[PDB]
Design a protein around this ligand. Structure first.
Ligand code: FES
Ligand code: FES
Ligand code: FES
Ligand code: FES
Ligand SMILES: [Cl-]
Ligand SMILES: [Cl-]
Ligand SMILES: [Cl-]
Ligand SMILES: [Cl-]
Ligand SMILES: [Mg+2]
Ligand SMILES: [Mg+2]
Ligand SMILES: [Mg+2]
Ligand SMILES: [Mg+2]
Ligand SMILES: [Mg+2]
Ligand SMILES: [Mg+2]
Lengths: 907, 907
């Protein structure tokens, strides 16, 4: 051990450390500076950025031996605090740079380092700095972060007053549609919002820390578990196995479709008889620290009989493949789509037909924060779980029978969280922590490292797809045929539903009167399927949007004009036979057309012999809602202090559940003149907030926004004075009148798609958009650079523009990754950010352009649709279409790795 | 476990706690708020004061179940931080309220609570508030704290500008003699100075926490130790016993006198063959937490043969008493005093003689911070100890042979500390932590609780005393006889030396040409003797100063005039035959006389039938130095940045080692124009600071102050430019000239007192003073209230007046405790602050008056003497003399408990 006397955030610290200890651990654990965020732990994400003697360093790869006596360290806590914000922190708030907020401390500390060395950076200087220092963000698409740095710099430079970093009220008093900052922004930019790992450090002594004993093969029969050596190791309390589970030891898919050939009870909590994928949790070590639990987990011995593993959909779907779940065929679900007339004769007599085989793979979510959860037994006797769940009520019912509790004896709470992008539509660690809390009676905390986040959370499910179009010479679509095979890994939850998305969204955007297709879901031993932003649309619309360009090519027609010819107009129906609710695609195409023509001319002009530029187009469509007559509930409560609490379980991945609630409530409460800062939101809790539903399907703004609106309308009625005006809280209480008022809303016009035909009216509100990608391909290397993205977006009406701009930029950046670099195919190689192709700042263009063409929705609150998944529906199709424009080569199977592009160029 | 969402220091905290947990632990351990200081842990000291929903509460006795959801908490961290100080914090700095600083956070939070409920308190309102909220201070005597509250209130009330809370430079630029604040004040008032227990919380995982297995009988032969059950208990690493000690397992007294009958190697580190006092450490449990170590320590079984214990000096000194250390008589040392002619014939022929038997007991130091230390093996192979040692070099040599290390392989460092008042002139926990670090190879940390601070640290040693005076009718002293028996408990360290103090200080202040006396030191099984502020003078001068009043009474002379007649004047010698170095007692008496006469008249006027007022006088004298030719060393270094570091091992109990260094150096460096904020001090460290010596004997200002002066003079010479002016650092380095310059100083004129006669010149500088106490005695209850204390003090020249005023107030308050309420006689009853008679604020008068009558010392730096122990030399004699004045009763044996006074009143 060594004494080190240093200065941290301006205060002398008399430190006692192991010279080999990581600065991240010293700062977080010994000094309580949990504003230093840790994600990857491998020096790749910048979340743990600190200033050390004037240099920006990653604390997770800086050992204490590199910290000299007398060193100066700055963390986010030293940059500024609430009520003493630094210009960078104020700028971040104003520009909406904190979505999940997990990367915000690291970017802000890094930016301070930049500005202390270059006071007046160009935007490119800012981008080069964040690239060098590996500052990674999965939510924002980087542009808002650069905007914030530039604005702060101008203030620091005296070019602009600091008061301009403070939001100015529009002065109609209206925050709906504005750039009003989100309530959680100040906590995020100051490192004072506690995420799950932070909470773990601030839990009491006697909390047990868990480590997972995981399968190191993809498929096996388990013969036994030997824990004897692990029990003798430092700090070890006990080891938990399936024997300690008090219920069924299975997670239920809950809404398994009746025509599914499996019962939906296939997923174990702790493996008993079998390993179904690499990473499966077989046991939990409980110890006094994460480090001691992990060390002991390495010594637990599992006796297994390894079995041949099926690592792709086609392999598992082979007629003779062995059943992974004995008693259920590997191909466990099929969804037909049968619209209009038989397609065979139409294809035979059509002027033109095209066909393609396409693939979209196992995209990894890659939030900067790896999965984390904890659980405890309340003094009320209930089991409490605090996790990254974005569907607390949904998960309660998925896990309760498995853990052996009635629903009233389990409570799920959503912690503040560093992004999910859908992986948290699935249970991950909730049932594991519940089992351990129940078995030990003690609080328990489980943190995944980044390798476990990659290997042992669910993934976008690969689809192998064949799609065909028949059309007239003038480009009018006559018919479509479609076939898709969905690789769902071993766990069925929502796999059938994901397969149904193919019926709904393959070919969406156009009038197609005649469709014949079939989706099939197959169990495999690769990673299980969890929702990934877009949930079937990124697969579906990659195929159809690439195929539209192929059709345009074969007709000698411009691909934007082919889309214009076919885009939904009054009288048309979507693939499930439903009339669209608004018709904004022609408007958006017309407004994009001259920008598209200008982009074409620029690409022709600026192309060289070696660097070929191209422009690509696509349409995107997705529903806002879960299928059928989805519903939500909210409570609007006048508090004694005159503030109003709007109680919901709107789960915040980081998208803006807080500002969605405040903005929607503010608009609804305008008759009573309620200031936005007087409106409070609630963190999701199954015991004390209503069942607003999960934050999946780009649904909350519509469903919960409407419920909030109705609750607030009902609160206004409850407060109305006869003669005009409104009663105060005290007046209502004096008259023994209610102050906490419920509102509900249901999408009554919706119907579930039919099991035989696929036809129905699954959503009452959709999101519509038109993408344009501008790229350069180096034809010597095959490397593609995305130089610009544009999204024409119809969101109906904006609740908050900082929220919606950010959602779009983030989705476009994930599109670039999906198109060019991302996959989870190699269990080890793809288990790091860099290995799996995470997009760092230089991979995302600074030119991300949005044009809102909003057509108010009949059933949306104040006309709003959702936004969340719109920007990831088909940006990768636009990008691939742009590579084709540039070079003449079409990539059919994502991602467009350089070697793959080169092979195509040279064929 | 329960979730609690509350606000702490203005920030929302999502807390996860045990409802039974103490708020102090939650705040310190879970939230890292180590500004919440914990001392007594029993709700008696206020150090852990926090504001909870507008009420000031003691966090150490507030369970989390009493903290409601939505509660508001404020700790010192929420009051203000460095560079954002609250007016209370600025006021504390300006008024010198932070000495050790351990109570400062609690007083300041408490004061904020006061001012939030009463914005314009009277001084009495402030005193009533601190009494109610149990805010305890052992350093300051409370007056500076009240001064600070009043000044802050005026600013908060807009009656006075906040800039007036900032020190104004005297503008001759001179800080010597000023009220310049101490460098450590800002850290103390903000809770950002880490004391030993704070450091323990900020040590790395894998640090082992120790608990002591202690004797629960006073005297025994040990037969064995059974650790088997303890080893099976939660979190337990190992148990350490004498078998694990690698050296002699004995502490050496090091400077044991040759005529001592013991070898000075009597004190074990871990008991092997015997228990010598209640509390002796027999084993150490090493565990993952203090709580787990303590729980397991309760299960270690010690097999003992209890022996009859001698619990007082007279009991142990009986001719037939059994030897506690077999082979050494219990009476192990005697010091004669033989000055002038045989006293028998002089007493026989004298006009008047008086005699008394007196007792001063086992006063407990009662710092607010209980003992704490830690140790580790450095990567350099050395063993490092960080403790409350106030003699790091001294303790290194006292313990090294016992622990089994050569002096170069052990390093002792003084942590910031919450007071000692001399108990840390002894080793306490240093050898224990060293043994455990060496045995385990791991960092180890040991914190005593308050009961262990009381039972198992050393104490003022009781003295049974008989003193006699012979005098002429005109009051001229002719002769003195003296006999004292010193109860040193079982461990000899510095016991002989303490006994020698009786020869030096019984009757000090007066010309006494003929003295015959004998001091004896006896081992007992009550608590071992450690230095307590005054170190023999409080015993010695209680006897002689009470006896002077008895002599005045018998002569019918005023007791101030009797002292005036006899006080040292040129030509006189002190008891050891040495000429005083200055003669300030007549001056001080003359200046006090009219105040004394006025106080007498007020007492007569304001006395009632039931409440009798009185006035008492005493003189105090003590040396500044350790005996003989004491010495110190300092290094003055010009740093590259133009600051100057003054390297010393001046140990800071809280008295002001920091400001002593800065003020002394500043004065010495004036020719080169060095600003005070450019002068840095060093925390004591045996490896990297010179052997400046211990902070005992009121010596550092003289010895180390002179060394600092000489080093700085030498640095000036090193920096001098030919032609005038001074070179810069860069200029000196360019010329390869030295920048770190040594200075030494020795008290060359001093000699050790003789073993046969007691005669010598032990100190070259003494401190001189005259006390006046004003009291009221309720003759129905026997309760004494001290209404006023005055000290006339000759300190030569003041280094810093905030330091010296505070030292005097603190000593006067300890005097009031020694006179009226304090002891450690009952092992259990006196093991709490309240049980042992700690003086809370109402026990200390607001009227504490100082008059400086400074006569510059020939050998002091810039004429300075020490101050530390002066104010505790005889204030308790003045107080007892005042009770006599008031009521006619003399208390001979301290303390003057009410029942004891009543029995005397009624006899
Ligand atoms: S770079 Fe340190 S946590 Fe990712
Ligand atoms: S806001 Fe950057 S990772 Fe979420
Ligand atoms: S009153 Fe809480 S530590 Fe003393
Ligand atoms: S300053 Fe108050 S206890 Fe030391
Ligand atoms: Cl391909
Ligand atoms: Cl490649
Ligand atoms: Cl008495
Ligand atoms: Cl009493
Ligand atoms: Mg500022
Ligand atoms: Mg038509
Ligand atoms: Mg190749
Ligand atoms: Mg202020
Ligand atoms: Mg004389
Ligand atoms: Mg009695």
């Amino acid at each position: 051990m060594i004494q080190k006397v240093i200065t941290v955030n301006g205060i002398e610290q008399n430190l006692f450390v192991d010279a080999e200890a990581l600065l991240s651990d010293v700062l977080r654990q010994q000094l309580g500076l949990t504003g230093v965020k840790v994600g990857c732990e491998q020096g790749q994400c910048g979340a743990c950025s600190v200033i050390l003697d004037g240099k920006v360093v990653r604390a997770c790869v800086t050992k204490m031996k590199r910290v000299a006596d007398g060193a100066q360290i700055t963390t986010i806590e030293g940059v500024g605090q609430p009520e003493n914000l630094h210009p960078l922190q104020k700028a971040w708030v104003l520009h909406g740079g904190a979505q999940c907020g997990f990367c915000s401390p690291g970017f802000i500390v890094s930016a301070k380092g930049l500005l202390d060395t270059n006071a007046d950076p160009s935007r490119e200087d800012v981008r080069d700095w964040f690239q060098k220092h590996r500052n990674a963000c999965r939510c924002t698409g980087y542009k808002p972060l650069v905007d914030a740095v530039m604005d702060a710099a101008a203030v620091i430079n005296g070019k602009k007053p600091e008061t301009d970093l403070e939001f100015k009220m529009p002065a109609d008093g209206r925050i709906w549609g504005s750039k009003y900052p989100r309530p959680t922004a100040v906590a995020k930019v100051t490192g004072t919002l506690d995420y799950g790992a932070d909470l773990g450090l601030k839990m009491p002594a006697g909390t047990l820390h868990l480590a997972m004993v995981q399968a190191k093969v993809s498929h096996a029969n388990i013969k036994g578990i030997d824990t004897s050596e692990a029990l003798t190791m430092p700090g070890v309390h006990s080891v938990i196995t399936h024997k300690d589970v008090k219920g069924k030891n299975r997670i239920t898919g809950l809404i398994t479709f009746p025509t599914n050939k499996g019962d939906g009870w296939d997923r174990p909590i702790l493996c008993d008889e079998k390993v179904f994928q690499y990473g499966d949790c077989i046991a939990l070590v409980c110890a006094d620290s994460e480090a001691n639990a992990r060390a002991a987990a390495e010594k637990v011995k599992v006796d297994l009989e390894e079995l041949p593993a099926y690592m792709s959909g086609p392999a598992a779907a082979a007629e003779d493949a062995i059943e992974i779940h004995p008693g259920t065929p590997n191909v466990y679900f099929e969804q037909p789509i049968v619209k209009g007339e038989d397609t065979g004769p139409i294809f035979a007599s059509a002027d033109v037909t095209v066909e393609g085989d396409f693939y979209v793979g196992r995209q990894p979510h890659m939030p900067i924060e790896p999965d984390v959860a904890f659980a405890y037994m309340g003094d009320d006797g209930k089991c409490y779980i605090h996790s990254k769940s974005i569907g607390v009520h949904l998960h309660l019912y998925m896990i309760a029978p498995g853990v052996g509790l009635e629903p009233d004896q389990l409570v799920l709470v959503a912690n503040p969280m560093g992004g999910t992008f859908g992986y948290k539509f699935s249970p991950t660690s909730e049932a594991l922590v519940a089992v351990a809390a129940m078995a030990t009676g003690r609080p328990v905390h489980l943190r995944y490292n980044y390798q476990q986040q990659q290997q042992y959370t669910g993934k976008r499910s690969p689809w192998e797809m064949n799609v065909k179009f028949a059309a007239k010479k003038d480009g009018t679509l006559l018919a479509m045929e479609s076939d898709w095979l969905v690789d769902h890994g071993p766990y069925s939850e929502f796999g059938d539903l994901l397969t149904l998305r193919g019926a709904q969204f393959i070919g969406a955007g156009y009038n197609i009167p005649n469709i014949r297709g079939l989706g099939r879901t197959v169990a495999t031993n690769h990673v299980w399927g969890s929702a990934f932003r877009g949930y079937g649309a990124p697969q579906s619309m990659f195929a159809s949007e690439c195929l539209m360009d192929m059709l345009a090519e074969k007709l000698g027609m411009d691909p934007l004009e082919l889309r214009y010819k076919n885009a939904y107009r009054p009288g048309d129906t979507n693939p499930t036979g439903q009339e669209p609710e608004v018709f904004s695609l022609p408007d958006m195409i017309d407004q994009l057309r001259p920008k598209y023509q200008a982009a074409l001319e620029k690409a022709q002009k600026e192309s060289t012999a070696t660097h070929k530029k191209g422009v690509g187009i696509s349409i995107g469509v997705y529903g806002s809602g879960l299928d059928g007559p989805d519903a939500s509930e909210a409570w609007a409560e006048l508090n004694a202090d005159g503030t109003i609490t709007v109680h919901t379980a709107w789960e915040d991945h980081g998208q803006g559940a807080d500002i969605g609630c405040v903005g929607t409530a503010h608009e609804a409460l305008r008759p009573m003149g309620v200031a936005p800062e007087k409106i409070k939101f609630t963190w999701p809790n199954t015991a004390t907030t209503p069942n607003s539903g999960p934050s999946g399907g780009s649904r909350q703004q519509v469903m919960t926004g409407n419920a909030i609106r109705v609750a607030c309308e009902n609160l206004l009625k409850a407060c109305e004075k006869p003669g005009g005006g409104y009663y105060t809280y005290d007046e209502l209480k004096a008259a023994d009148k209610p102050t906490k008022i419920t509102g509900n809303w249901t999408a009554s016009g919706a119907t579930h798609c039919d099991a035989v035909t696929g036809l129905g009216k699954p959503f009452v509100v959709y999101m519509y958009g038109v993408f344009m990608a501008e790229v350069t391909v180096d034809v010597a290397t095959g490397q593609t650079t995305v130089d610009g993205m544009t999204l024409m977006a119809d969101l109906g009406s904006l609740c908050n523009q900082l929220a919606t701009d950010g959602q779009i930029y983030g989705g476009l950046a994930q599109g670039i990754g999906l198109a060019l670099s991302e996959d989870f195919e190699d269990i080890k190689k793809h288990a790091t950010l860099v290995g799996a192709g995470f997009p760092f700042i230089k991979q995302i263009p600074d030119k991300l352009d949005i044009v809102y063409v909003n057509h108010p929705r009949p059933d949306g609150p104040f006309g709003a649709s959702g936004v969340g998944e719109l920007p990831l529906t088909s940006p990768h199709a636009a990008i691939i279409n742009a590579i084709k424009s540039a070079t003449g080569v079409r990539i059919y199977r994502l991602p467009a790795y350089p070697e793959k592009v080169l092979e195509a160029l040279k064929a």
